[PDB]
């Protein structure tokens, strides 16, 4: 979909593997807010959604969070506390084909700056100048949208760049969605690293009589360290105490 | 490569009726948008009419001059592509070129982004007289 | 409307030297959606340019056409004996497309 509409699609219920993605094609941009792509295996995800649109290649470096521009004023905005990747690459093979593809949109006016995650979908004419021109297109009123022109023989800034964006929330709730790395035994009242989807840490677990929400899986009773987890396997919960202590 | 062939020109009188057609072959006839083009003879060309696919269900829009006298219409399974004539005047003897919008435009609400003509027909003498 | 002038009307060049062309509008029209058409007599015109600075397919590097805004130019350099025809400048980012009067063009 074009950049002034762009598609959000739910993941949900399957395993976030990108290590196919690498003979699919190579990104020209993947850095990740709030989360480490080395880390990216390692850990459980929440709530996982897709942005998707195509944009240029001079205009890549306005989807970022604290970024300015044309498209992350009047088309796509980013939160500052952003937690995702952003993937981009280019795709003057399939996107720009010969002649002209004009099915790719941008919204070049609007009277002002967008929230985070908003689109506007609106065809009104913009009343740029003082004189209200209702409805019909001349001087001091514009039609927003502008067509992007894809041409096989444009320089790189302006091919087309296929964009896709995951927003994800670490460790809130229940994880549908992770990484490639297999589940092993779980070893009970012992010192041992363990990786509670996602939680790393050190320490000998328990078992608890805590009761909890359905929407709660990670609990703290003082808010510096997780005293109990629910196993995603069985669903009792083990509260997790520190593996050295006693006071010796 | 691409063939635009019409057919049902002739010499008519004033405030009559008659109907063209144009046949083609060669490409996906029923993805590209369609215009039709007139050349009066020692004039310059004018546009007379467009229609559109299934994406906006054979969406049709016209000249100043045209409007209300004029039915474009096109069936894609014998690709076959349609004009109805109708109240004619004097100022209608022309050649009636049916050229090929090119496929990539995309159309918006009312704005149309890169609806060019890319390939022509050669086109019947109709004359009013 | 968008009412496009061409001027000059009338061309008469020798092969091999350099002519230009120009069409003008009334109002500006939306991102240079601008074509080039030329007609030899027997046969319909052929796309040239498109967006009036982009080739068409089967176009050589000699077919050149530039400008933006109101004011355009297209440019034709080494003539050949079959360059004959009429050229044309249509409008099309702007409803209704509009015609150009034209511009005859003749080889000595």
């Known amino acids: 979909a074009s950049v002034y509409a762009w598609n959000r699609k739910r993941i949900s219920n399957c395993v976030a593997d990108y290590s196919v993605l690498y003979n699919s094609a190579s990104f020209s941009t993947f850095k990740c807010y709030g989360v480490s792509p080395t880390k990216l295996n390692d850990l459980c995800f929440t709530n996982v959604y897709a942005d998707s649109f195509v944009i240029r290649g001079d205009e890549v470096r306005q989807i970022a969070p604290g970024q300015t521009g044309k498209i992350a004023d009047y088309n796509y905005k980013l939160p500052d506390d952003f937690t995702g990747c952003v993937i981009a690459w280019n795709s003057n093979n399939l996107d720009s084909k010969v002649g002209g593809n004009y099915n790719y949109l941008y919204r070049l006016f609007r009277k002002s700056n967008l929230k985070p995650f908003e689109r506007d979908i609106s065809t009104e004419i913009y009343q740029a100048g003082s004189t209200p021109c209702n409805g019909v297109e001349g001087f001091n009123c514009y039609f927003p949208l502008q067509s992007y022109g894809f041409q096989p023989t444009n320089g790189v800034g302006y091919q087309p760049y296929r964009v896709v964006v995951l927003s994800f929330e670490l460790l809130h709730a229940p994880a549908t969605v992770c990484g490639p790395k297999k589940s092993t035994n779980l070893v009970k009242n012992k010192c041992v690293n363990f990786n509670f989807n996602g939680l790393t840490g050190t320490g000998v677990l328990t078992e608890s009589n805590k009761k909890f929400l359905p929407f709660q899986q990670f609990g703290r009773d003082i808010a510096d360290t997780t005293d109990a987890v629910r196993d995603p396997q069985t669903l009792e919960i083990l509260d997790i105490t520190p593996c050295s202590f006693g006071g010796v | 490569e691409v063939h635009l062939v019409e057919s049902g020109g002739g010499l008519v009188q004033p405030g009559g009726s008659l109907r063209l057609s144009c046949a083609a072959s060669?490409?996906?006839?029923?993805?590209?948008?369609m215009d039709w083009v007139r050349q009066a003879p020692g004039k310059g060309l004018e546009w007379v009419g467009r229609?559109?696919?299934?994406?906006?269900?054979?969406?049709?829009e016209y000249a100043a001059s045209v409007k209300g006298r004029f039915t474009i219409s096109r069936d894609d399974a014998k690709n076959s592509l349609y004009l109805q004539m109708n109240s004619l005047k004097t100022e209608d003897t022309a050649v009636y070129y049916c050229?090929?919008?090119?496929?990539?435009?995309?159309?918006?609400?009312?704005?149309?982004?890169?609806?060019?003509?890319?390939?022509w027909g050669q086109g019947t003498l109709v004359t009013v007289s | 409307e968008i009412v496009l002038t061409q001027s000059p009307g009338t061309l008469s060049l020798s092969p091999g030297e350099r002519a230009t062309l120009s069409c003008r509008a009334s109002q500006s029209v939306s991102s240079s959606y601008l074509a080039w058409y030329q007609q030899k007599p027997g046969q319909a015109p052929r796309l040239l340019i498109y967006?009036?600075?982009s080739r068409a397919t089967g176009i050589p590097d000699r077919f050149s056409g530039s400008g933006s805004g109101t004011d355009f130019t297209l440019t034709i350099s080494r003539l050949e004996p079959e360059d004959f025809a009429v050229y044309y400048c249509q409008q099309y980012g702007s409803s209704p497309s509009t015609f150009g009067q034209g511009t005859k063009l003749e080889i000595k």
């Open positions: 229609t559109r696919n299934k994406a906006n269900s054979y969406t049709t």
């Open positions: 060669g490409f996906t006839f029923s993805d590209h948008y």
């Open positions: 050229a090929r919008v090119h496929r990539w435009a995309y159309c918006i609400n009312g704005v149309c982004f890169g609806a060019y003509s890319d390939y």
């Open positions: 967006g009036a600075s």
